Every structure is written in structure tokens, then in C-alpha cells.
Amino acid sequence: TSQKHRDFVAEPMGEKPVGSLAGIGEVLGKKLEERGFDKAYVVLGQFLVLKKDEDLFREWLKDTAGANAKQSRDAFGALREWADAF
Ligand SMILES: [Cs+]
Ligand SMILES: [Cs+]
């Protein structure tokens, strides 16, 4: 199961790795780690630097991590939900 939406939002981000964010696979996490998005805090940062736009974060995550629709959407929802919480 990839039901890690709950585990990410029931505590703060902190020094959490990128692969801990929902939709960030073990393969995606490598393509993301070499660009300097090694932690889930760095992806949160990019999403805020994009003003939390859904299809701009999803456009960048495709243009960089090589993400698919389910991966890019599950990642955005997890960031949006965590922003909506803390
Ligand atoms: Cs970077
Ligand atoms: Cs809140």
C-alpha cells in the first residue's frame, strides 16, 4: 500500500527524506536526489517557491523527477494537505 498520506501529516517534516512524501517512489527519489531535492523539506520549499500552484509543481516534478500523473498528484496533495495543517 502507498497510504503514506496519513504518516506524513500526523507529525512535522523536519529532516524527513524525500521518499517519505506520498507519491515519491524509490526510483523517483534518485532522479530527485541528484537535483538537490534529497529531503521532503526541499520539495515543500519548491512548492512554496511556486506559490502552491497545482499544475506548476506537477509540471516541474515531471520536468525534473520524471514523475507520472499519480506520483505528481499524490505528492502535491500531501504538500497541500501539510501546508493546510502547519
Ligand atoms: Cs536544488
Ligand atoms: Cs492550521
Residue numbers in the entry: 3 to 88
Task: List sentences from the manuscript.
Barrier-to-autointegration factor (BAF), encoded by the BANF1 gene, is an abundant and ubiquitously expressed metazoan protein that has multiple functions during the cell cycle. Here, we demonstrate that VRK1 successively phosphorylates BAF on Ser4 and Thr3.
And only residues Thr3, Ser4 and Gln5 have a Cα atom displaced by more than 2 Å after fitting the two structures. However, comparison of the dynamics of BAF and pBAF in solution by NMR revealed that the motions observed in BAF are strongly reduced in pBAF. We showed that the crystal structures of BAF and di-phosphorylated (pBAF) are similar. Thus, phosphorylation of Ser4 and Thr3 drastically reduces the conformational mobility of BAF.
